[PDB]
Every structure is written in C-alpha cells, then in structure tokens.
Amino acid sequence: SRKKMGLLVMAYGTPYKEEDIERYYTHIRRGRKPEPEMLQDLKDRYEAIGGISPLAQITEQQAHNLEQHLNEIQDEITFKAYIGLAHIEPFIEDAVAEMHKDGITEAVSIVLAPHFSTFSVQSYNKRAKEEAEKLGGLTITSVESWYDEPKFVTYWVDRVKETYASMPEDERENAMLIVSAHSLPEKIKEFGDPYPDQLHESAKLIAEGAGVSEYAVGWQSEGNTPDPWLGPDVQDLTRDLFEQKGYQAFVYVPVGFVADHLEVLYDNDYECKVVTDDIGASYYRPEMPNAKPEFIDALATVVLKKLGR
C-alpha cells in the first residue's frame, strides 16, 4: 500500500572529524591541497568555535528528524533519508548509490540552503541525477529553492521579533538587521542566477514580518578568486552602516545557512562580533534553525508541496 521513497538531503558538508579537514579543504579548492599553514589556520578556526565535532551532527539530526516527521504527518509515503554532501563523505554520489543499493526507485531531494544558485543547488541536483542515471532504475525530483516557504519565513520572523523585544529601548530604536547568505562570484549573474534576488526577497519578507525599521543585505564567507564576489561582506557592511548612522545594535540573520556551522559560528559570531565590539554596538544572532521542530515542519511542507501531496 504505502510506497517507499528516498529522501535525499543534500548540503555543502562539514567534516565529522578533524582528520578529514584536509581532504574537505582540497575538495573545496578543486584538487589543490592546502599548504600546511593554511590547513592549520582552518583547524584553528574550528577550534576557536569550540571544535568541529558538533557540526556534522546537526545535519544528521536534520535528516533524521525530517524523515521521522514526514512519516508521521502523512500515510501515503514512507520516506528514508539519505545525506549527500558536496565536499566530504558521504558524498552526494555515495548517497544516491546507497539509495539504489537499498532498492529505492523514486526519490525527492532537498538542499539545506533555501536559495537557489547555479553554483550550489543546481550543481548538487545535477550530481544527484547524474549518479542516478549511471545506476539506472532510480529517478530523483529535486527541490530548487524554498526560501519563500511561509513556515520558514515565520521561523526567522519570530526569532527576529524575539531578539528585538529582548533589547533595551535605546538599542531597539537604533538597531540594524543584516540579512546574509554565502557569497558567490558576481559572475553568476551573467548566467541569470537568481540567488541574489532571492536573498533580497528573504530579507524583505523577514524584516517586514518582524516589524524591523532598518535592514540591509550582505554576503559572507566569500572566497579568494580575483574576480568580484557578491558583496558587501557583512564585516564591511557593519562598519559602513555604523559609520553612517551609529547603530548601537546589529542583528545578524544568516538566512542562507540552516545550522550552527563554521560560516555562522565563526564568520558571524566571531568576525562580525569583532566589529560590533570594536564600534561599541551590541551583537545579536538569533538561533539557527538547526534540527528544531518548527524548521523540520517547514522542510516537510516544502517536500510535500514539491510532490503535490
């Protein structure tokens, strides 16, 4: 009766253990192994945020919770989740191969990044579908974006409202909300990539839903290829906006990220906090979705909507 489907949950990835950081970094660097000092600097960043070990566990918990919740809220499909990561084991291809081995013939995929981009989501979905094509007898339908799912917007609206209500009056009336996602090369716009437009729309939805009077859109975690990356960077944006108007509180909503990973714990909670401490402003960064029920329900709704169910 009740049919079985694979649930392919994809993400950029974080190593599960320190010994895999070098191979992760090499993958991200397109085969160029980091020099030893560069490797140690990355290791030191994971140490600085309390250790790498908790990070991969969040993605595990998200996939686990999403399977369980999807299987409780409807009876037509029994999902089995498989995690496929872009840059470290289990790779996207490994997950699809495991689905196929397990007898899955039909799967739905979702990327744990709400905005579509040609560099991330589209590439992950193509990798998944190419592996399925090689194995045969398995097809995948893929979610491309979900930033506009109302339950996801409401997660962030509610967290942002909570944070502003937490503030003393003078911060409330002199605060700036910075909404961000992972930078990519500006060149994606020459392929018509809507990624920046979707980040701006997330910011608009969240700011207006939360009743925030002043907000700005920034990017974080850019790379180092010489051609321009989407900007401004959140560190620069923070200072710039302070230099204009003297905000005494900054609230960071790294809406492009779904978990407490290095880009949030280091690039927001360390690098942006350095800047807010320097200028005398308070720092706030509301809880990331992680594996909390409200967020899992938002993702389950995304998946069921994709299937028309």
Ligand SMILES: [Mg+2]
């Ligand atoms: Mg190994």
Ligand SMILES: [Mg+2]
């Ligand atoms: Mg293979």
Ligand SMILES: [Mg+2]
């Ligand atoms: Mg859509």
Ligand SMILES: [Mg+2]
């Ligand atoms: Mg950086």
